[PDB]
Design a protein around this ligand. Structure first.
Ligand SMILES: Nc1ncnc2c1ncn2[C@@H]1O[C@@H]2COP(=O)(O)OP(=O)(O)OC[C@H]3O[C@@H](O[C@@H]1[C@@H]2O)[C@H](O)[C@@H]3O
Lengths: 99, 104
């Protein structure tokens, strides 16, 4: 069992990790890597972007960079983009590799 | 100006919002809506997923057309350096402030 810092190194290597002390069942987090897209892709191709964002991009622009980030497979089976580490998650040492 | 609760209502309506008290300049946040995807598409047609996750989906749903995985809505930030951050989070000060404004 490991610290949050070790779990973050395993996430950057592509593993799934979880805390034993979480309330929800069968959950895990994983990392999604950075991506860089031409601005035309963003305005015409990328799904799930608001029109207001797309207009700002068109108005202010080569390439747009999406930073890497963490995600969660939740207890209900949903995927949450943008998982949050609580105070307890960050300071705990009950992290485990789950895949 | 507005409370975070009002900013959240405008985000759900498709607006861009920002706090006047943020340190970085020219920033804003926006909402990306929930989506529902077929599980076969998650295994081979979605970029930016690790193999370990694709393997998990393949093991727990299989080669299925009917089966779908729901991605919930979430907030994103256009940062000070121009990068886009999927999964913006609200600090204590963000949550309790009343200096929110609409930017678009
Ligand atoms: N000891 C604790 N300290 C700080 N916050 C805690 C907490 N216990 C629960 N919470 C939070 O309060 C809400 C309901 O919690 P739960 O639904 O019971 O969450 P859980 O299944 O334990 O998953 C854990 C994941 O949920 C998120 O934090 C939750 C979630 O916002 C965060 O991303 C975490 O990694």
């Amino acid at each position: 069992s490991m610290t949050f810092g070790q779990a973050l190194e395993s996430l950057k290597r592509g593993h799934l990790v979880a805390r034993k002390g979480w309330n929800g069942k069968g959950m895990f987090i994983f990392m999604r890597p950075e991506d860089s897209l031409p601005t035309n892709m963003i305005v015409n191709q990328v799904k799930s972007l608001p029109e207001s964002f797309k207009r700002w991009v068109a108005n202010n622009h080569d390439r747009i960079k999406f930073t890497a980030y963490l995600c969660m497979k939740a207890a209900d089976g949903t995927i949450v983009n943008g998982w949050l580490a609580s105070q307890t998650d960050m300071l705990a040492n009950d992290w485990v590799i789950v895949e």
